[PDB]
Amino acid sequence: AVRKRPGMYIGSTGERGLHHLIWEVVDNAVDEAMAGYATTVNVVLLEDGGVEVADDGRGIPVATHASGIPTVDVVMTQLHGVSVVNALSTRLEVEIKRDGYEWSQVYEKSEPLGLKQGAPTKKTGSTVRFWADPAVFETTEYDFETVARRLQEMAFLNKGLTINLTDERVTQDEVVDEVVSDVAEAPKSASERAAESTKVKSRTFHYPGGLVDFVKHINRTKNAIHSSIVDFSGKGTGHEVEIAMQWNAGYSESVHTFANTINTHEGGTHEEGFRSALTSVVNKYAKKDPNLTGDDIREGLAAVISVKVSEPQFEGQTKTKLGNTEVKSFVQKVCNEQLTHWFEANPTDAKVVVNKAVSSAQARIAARKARELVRRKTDIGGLPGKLADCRSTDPRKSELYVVEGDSAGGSAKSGRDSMFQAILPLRGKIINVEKARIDRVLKNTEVQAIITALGTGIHDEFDIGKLRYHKIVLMADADVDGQHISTLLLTLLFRFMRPLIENGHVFLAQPPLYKLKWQRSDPEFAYSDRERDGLLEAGLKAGKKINKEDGIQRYKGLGEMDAKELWETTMDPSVRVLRQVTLDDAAAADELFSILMGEDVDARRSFITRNAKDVRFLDVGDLTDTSLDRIEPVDIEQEMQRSYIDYAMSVIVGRALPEVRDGLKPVHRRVLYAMFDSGFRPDRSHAKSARSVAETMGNYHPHGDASIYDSLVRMAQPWSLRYPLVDGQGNFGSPGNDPPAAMRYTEARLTPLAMEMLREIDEETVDFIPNYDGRVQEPTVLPSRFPNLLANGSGGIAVGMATNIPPHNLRELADAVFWALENHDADEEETLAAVMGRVKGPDFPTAGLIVGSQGTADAYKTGRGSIRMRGVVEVEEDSRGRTSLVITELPYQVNHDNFITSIAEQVRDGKLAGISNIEDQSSDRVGLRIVIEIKRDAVAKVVINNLYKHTQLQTSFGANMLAIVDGVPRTLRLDQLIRYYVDHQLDVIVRRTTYRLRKANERAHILRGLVKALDALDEVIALIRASETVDIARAGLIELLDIDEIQAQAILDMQLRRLAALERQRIIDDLAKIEAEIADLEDILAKPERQRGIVRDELAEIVDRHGDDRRTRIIAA
Amino acid sequence: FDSGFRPDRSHAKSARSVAETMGNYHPHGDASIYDSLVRMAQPWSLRYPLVDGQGNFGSPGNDPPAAMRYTEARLTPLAMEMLREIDEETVDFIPNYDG
Amino acid sequence: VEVEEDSRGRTSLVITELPYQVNHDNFITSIAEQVRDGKLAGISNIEDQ
Amino acid sequence: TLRLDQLIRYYVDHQLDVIVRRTTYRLRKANERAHILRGLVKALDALDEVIALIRASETVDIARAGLIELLDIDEIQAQAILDMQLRRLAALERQRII
Amino acid sequence: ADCRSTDPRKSELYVVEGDSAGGSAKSGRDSMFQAILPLRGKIINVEKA
């Protein structure tokens, strides 16, 4: 019945509808706590796509209904709802505890099977278990963050209710904690690690304070002015109200209204009753200027209004607008009487909230006055030269495409149907309006262009009736920049143009995700993996042909498509499918937007870590699936979440955190792989840097030369890397402010150690993935035959994640690895204690000293520590007898020229005394030589100590041992860094041996075919000659000699020079040697002991040849 | 031409043509190179376009072309007449920037 | 330049071709600015269709 | 600063230069190909003895010197016979050379 | 980058473009009598200035 169109009931056949299944089951379960019969509601998310909703209420009526069948079946099968949940589910189970018994009922494809009576028990409640229909829904994977956000909210509205959420679709290594630690996990003993295998993400929400705890939660990130939250209630005839409010230092209205726990985002009678009463009370307290508007008072205010109406009447585009005219009168009476009570009882707090409204009133007055001066100064108006208008003058028919200028500005203006489609190319950067005030928001030229295009105005002067386009389409890229822009456009709309979302005017473009490039047939377009797979299958079964590498194009940017393509696939109303932005919960969305776009770096860093990797689940809804202007509704909560996680992970992986296995970021790895593939080896003459920059650019990293050349130069500088990976020729700059020379002048090649990063990469030792254009392959990780991440270190900061791994001594690290190889079975504590003691501490390329061992110890056992670095000072006396301090060494990454400047700036300002001059006498022959002449009056020791105190001559290294582990950002202990590295090394060796064996058997097969031909050479040559075409010579060879097609091709492609006596023997000799190589290769695969020895012997060989003396001296105190 | 980005073959990402130019002939920023490519592709710039482009190459107004990694480019048949038999020693060649 | 009369009967000029190398966006802005400054008269609006 | 006739003539002068250089190159590479083909033809006519010479020979360097004396050929012509694959000894491939 | 020598007769100043040989001149030099002035900006045409 309902199955025919999900829509008119559940909303959409996607995420919105999938989450709407949980909402209905949770709503009637929460209805018990509102009635005062339930205290605990427990929600469980199952691995099989099921949801368990348990309560301790009264239980679903089991008694025989007036029709004939029991009431439990009537509510579940017949409409008037939870009956829709059963209608769009494959299986529904109900465990009811009512009338002092344990009832049990199972619904197979909505149809009931029978109500079974079980064990008698005095306790009451009900438990609902449902498995979503995979044939109906596009996805069956529930979002944990969305469910938790609504439950936390539901617990705020019900004082006596406790909500316990559990998520089973969690791996035993997945980040599950809401508050993610900035330190590593304690080392587990073999016992407690094994006992666990013989995990579930869980959250608890209980707020006794009710709406006071809600206001405290809203004003946690915001700075509350008054330390006293307003709390009052009112009881009516068929209604009840509860209001809590507190002002903050911010410049945004955070007022959330609810009716019978349901979020009334469209507002209504109850919100209007509060609003009118708030402006009445506030303005009356003033005791002569113009009256304060509601906007002025509500600006920087956090409030929650929760009404409980017996018979609720609804209005608006969504069922979230309370129209009960008796509630306006009721809320206004309760507000006017209780708001005056607070303003009189707390006058100290009242004076600041009125003054905050006064500041806000003068802010809009000054803005209107400044607006009026420019407003009347014969201007055409609109955005001339920016906006490309449509011919139509009717908003109903008019569509606006908001697109990034650099992405699809020109193509959208060309592809479009200029009769009803207008284009707004954003030719700048959209500011993050989350905590910004309307003045700063209106100062942004892109934000102002959007406001001018729409014609509505903003917050105070907003008018939905003046809207120029009834369709606002956001056309962003499916790349890091595109996803970032989406988050920024969604924040602008939610916070400043929310009614546009609610009235269904905000849309997101759905461009193709793939282009299937058939050899003969016309290119096809896929908007999902299931569509791509389906189109790929269907056309292979229609005999079409496609290249296995560069045959299916994956779109990242709209700028890849021609105007025609862009129109036909995403702009044409006859074939496009627009994604309508919906706002189902304004309170929940406010929490999500505040976390992601706010200023709480911790809650942000925590959100990204627990959502980093995609949810481990079997999405059966994406495996099976059963009009002109097509519209698909997507929720802002889900869409914003997707967008921010995608943006955050792209900058985290891309330029912030290195992969633990090789210690590299994509850029460095891509430069190194490009140089390697070009044959820029240490045994060959240097190649110009431009050559290496271009190879990286055109094949792996298609961005500006500067970023690529930056990676090359940093890997070449002997002061940047403890073990440089690029052998540079020419000017690569200085540890000061001297930059490298142009890439066309400097020369680069790989160092012998860089060759150890790339060692046997061609021997299928690492996973390769297709590159940016899918034409060729690039490695995911380099073999890294030496522990590079620890040896060379790594920096980088992106979206709340920062890394600082210091460089180390290769010889010392090798010992830690050698111990880890030999003692492969040792537990976490035994490894940690062994690695520490073998690796003394950080070893910087810029030598210097470390003062103390506490920070070094902290960084190894916890992944976080403060390592104090100190440079080396020498004392000199000239001819006359004048003393000067000579800086011979400095701490790591301290810029020489900036250090000299800081001292000079401190001396002239009198902050540093005893210094008479500073000079840079440094050269290759004299080493570092910063000469600081000291006044005859001054004591050398007293000047040196002041240089430690006030300059970078003594600075701290804030170690944060954070790296990418199996795609996830993780803070690690030293043992974890060594072990993860060793695991990669053993993987490289097994993958190496496997390849070598396959290619040895392939060579042997060929050589056996040539040997057969050499044994009967006379008749082989006679067969080729006698035969007319190459094919009969080929077929004749397969018959004459018991061989295959591959062997025949080896005999035919055989050169006449190979028939010589020393050349015939070369084949015979080579074939016999292969069987000994095969036995040894097969022996390595069968022996993990041999593989461990291969890692040991090859590392020792690298350490004996490239290992060096410690540079940084470790001193105490 | 040397890369084989000819009309008979599929468009290659503009970054490929920029990198090939940069590394072997014009070792300067990508911007100056991508500017040449774009202007030789734009039908409002050239009376006889020498580059055949795929994607957003901008507009005769202030709309810039998309990033070189997104746009695709190959020679037009007219550009093939420019390079026609250049491998047949028809023109004087000189050593490139690194000889 | 082409001439058009709409539903209302309002007259508007339509630029269908421009000289070589003249930037369309800069052309619209110069008209807009010259109208704003009072240098150009008889124009009520400019649109890129 | 040029006149239309100067712009037209300098262009026409470049086109004539391109054709003379194209004809020169094409003639040189035609003679180069033919010299190699004449060697292959010599080897095809005396195939039994050419194959027998290489097979009896110890090294490839003692094989080349014998091939230069067997057929009336030079170093460049002899190398092309050594680099000639077994698949080229097919009747239509032998005729293709001719 | 200063030289140790205070004698103008013995002292030498190498005026170089920072982007060209700022680093290499400062490293290669004999810092006893050779000083380096890397030009980190643009020299203006002073002819009619």
UniProtKB/Swiss-Prot annotation, chain B:
Per the database entry, which stretches of residues form a coiled coil?
Answer: none
The compartments listed are: Cytoplasm
| Outcome when changing G29A | Confers fluoroquinolone resistance, IC(50) is 2- to 26-fold higher than wild-type
Please name every pair of cysteines joined by a disulfide bond in this record.
none
Query: Reported effect of changing T21A?
Result: Slight resistance to fluoroquinolones. Hypersusceptibile, 2- to 14-fold higher sensitivity to fluoroquinolones, 2- to 8-fold more efficient in fluoroquinolone-induced DNA cleavage
Which residue windows are transmembrane per the record? none
Question: Outcome of D35H?
Answer: Confers ciprofloxacin resistance, in clinical isolate
Effect ascribed to mutating D35A: Confers ciprofloxacin resistance, in clinical isolate
| Catalytic center residues | Y70
Tell me what happens on changing D35G: Confers ciprofloxacin resistance, in clinical isolate
Tell me which family the UniProt entry assigns to this protein.
Belongs to the type II topoisomerase GyrA/ParC subunit family.
Misc remark:
When the enzyme transiently cleaves DNA a phosphotyrosine bond is formed between GyrA and DNA. In the presence of quinolones this intermediate can be trapped and is used as an indicator of drug toxicity. DNA gyrase is intrinsically more resistant to fluoroquinolone drugs than in E.coli, mutating it to resemble E.coli increases its susceptibility to fluoroquinolones (most quinolone-resistant mutations are in this subunit). Gyrase from M.tuberculosis is usually assayed in the presence of potassium glutamate (KGlu); KGlu stimulates supercoiling but inhibits DNA relaxation activity, and has concentration-dependent effects on GyrA-box mutants.
Query: What is written about domains in the entry's comments?
Result: The N-terminal domain (residues 1-502, also called GA57BK) forms a dimer; when reconstituted with intact GyrB or the C-terminus of GyrB (residues 448-675) can catalyze quinolone-mediated DNA breaks. The C-terminal domain (CTD, residues 514-838) contains 6 tandemly repeated subdomains known as blades, each of which is composed of a 4-stranded antiparallel beta-sheet. The blades form a circular-shaped beta-pinwheel fold arranged in a spiral around a screw axis, which binds DNA.
Q: What function is annotated for this protein?
A: A type II topoisomerase that negatively supercoils closed circular double-stranded (ds) DNA in an ATP-dependent manner to maintain chromosomes in an underwound state, while in the absence of ATP it relaxes supercoiled dsDNA. Also catalyzes the interconversion of other topological isomers of dsDNA rings, including catenanes. Gyrase from M.tuberculosis has higher decatenation than supercoiling activity compared to E.coli; as M.tuberculosis only has 1 type II topoisomerase, gyrase has to fulfill the decatenation function of topoisomerase IV as well. Negative supercoiling favors strand separation, and DNA replication, transcription, recombination and repair, all of which involve strand separation. Type II topoisomerases break and join 2 DNA strands simultaneously in an ATP-dependent manner.
Q: What is this protein called?
A: DNA gyrase subunit A
Stretch of the intact protein here = 60 to 158 of 838
From Swiss-Prot, chain C:
From the Swiss-Prot or TrEMBL record, state where the protein is found: Cytoplasm
Which purpose does this protein serve, as stated in its record? A type II topoisomerase that negatively supercoils closed circular double-stranded (ds) DNA in an ATP-dependent manner to maintain chromosomes in an underwound state, while in the absence of ATP it relaxes supercoiled dsDNA. Also catalyzes the interconversion of other topological isomers of dsDNA rings, including catenanes. Gyrase from M.tuberculosis has higher decatenation than supercoiling activity compared to E.coli; as M.tuberculosis only has 1 type II topoisomerase, gyrase has to fulfill the decatenation function of topoisomerase IV as well.
Which family, according to the similarity comment? Belongs to the type II topoisomerase GyrA/ParC subunit family.
Instruction: Print the miscellaneous field.
Output: When the enzyme transiently cleaves DNA a phosphotyrosine bond is formed between GyrA and DNA. In the presence of quinolones this intermediate can be trapped and is used as an indicator of drug toxicity. DNA gyrase is intrinsically more resistant to fluoroquinolone drugs than in E.coli, mutating it to resemble E.coli increases its susceptibility to fluoroquinolones (most quinolone-resistant mutations are in this subunit). Gyrase from M.tuberculosis is usually assayed in the presence of potassium glutamate (KGlu); KGlu stimulates supercoiling but inhibits DNA relaxation activity, and has concentration-dependent effects on GyrA-box mutants.
Q: How does it assemble?
A: Heterotetramer, composed of two GyrA and two GyrB chains. In the heterotetramer, GyrA contains the active site tyrosine that forms a transient covalent intermediate with DNA, while GyrB binds cofactors and catalyzes ATP hydrolysis.
Q: What is known of its domains?
A: The N-terminal domain (residues 1-502, also called GA57BK) forms a dimer; when reconstituted with intact GyrB or the C-terminus of GyrB (residues 448-675) can catalyze quinolone-mediated DNA breaks. The C-terminal domain (CTD, residues 514-838) contains 6 tandemly repeated subdomains known as blades, each of which is composed of a 4-stranded antiparallel beta-sheet. The blades form a circular-shaped beta-pinwheel fold arranged in a spiral around a screw axis, which binds DNA.
The name of this protein is DNA gyrase subunit A
Its gene is gyrA
What part of the full protein is here? 257 to 305 of 838
